[PDB]
Amino acid sequence: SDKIIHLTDDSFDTDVLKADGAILVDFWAEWCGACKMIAAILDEIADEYQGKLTVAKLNIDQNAGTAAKYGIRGIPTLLLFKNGEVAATKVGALSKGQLKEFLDANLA
Ligand SMILES: [Cu+2]
Known part of the structure; x- marks a missing residue:
């Protein structure tokens, strides 16, 4: 978790909307089973993609405002931001391989 940005309602603007480049935000909660595998894959992705992609987490139980703003309906949900x-x-849920091709699909 050393390479994952911890987001809240109060840091989302600065850390995501005003951030240059690509940020992958993981919307999750402790009660979400599928979110645990997502977390392990994301640690590897954050490491492998350093300098190309930032990875972040937003807990929906604790930050319902942000969850509502982005229309989150179920978790896990991954939102990829580019320049805000x-x-x-x-x-x-998806596999590491699927996440990599999802990321590739979003290349300029
Ligand atoms: Cu870590």
């Missing part, structure tokens, strides 16, 4: 705007989303 939503570029892509993926709802529900």
Whole structure:
């Protein structure tokens, strides 16, 4: 978790909306089973993609305002931001390989 940005309602603007480049935000909660595998994959992704992609987490139980703003309906949900705007989303569990091709799909 050393390479994952911890987001809240109060840091989201600065850390995501005003951030240059790509940020992958993981919307999660402790009660979400599928979110645990997502977390392990994301640690590897954050490491492998350092300097190309920032990875972050937003707990929806603790930050319902942000969850509502982005229309989160179920978790896990991954939101990919580029220069402060939503570029892509993926709802529900996926494999590491699938996440890599989802990321590749969003290359300029
Ligand atoms: Cu870590």
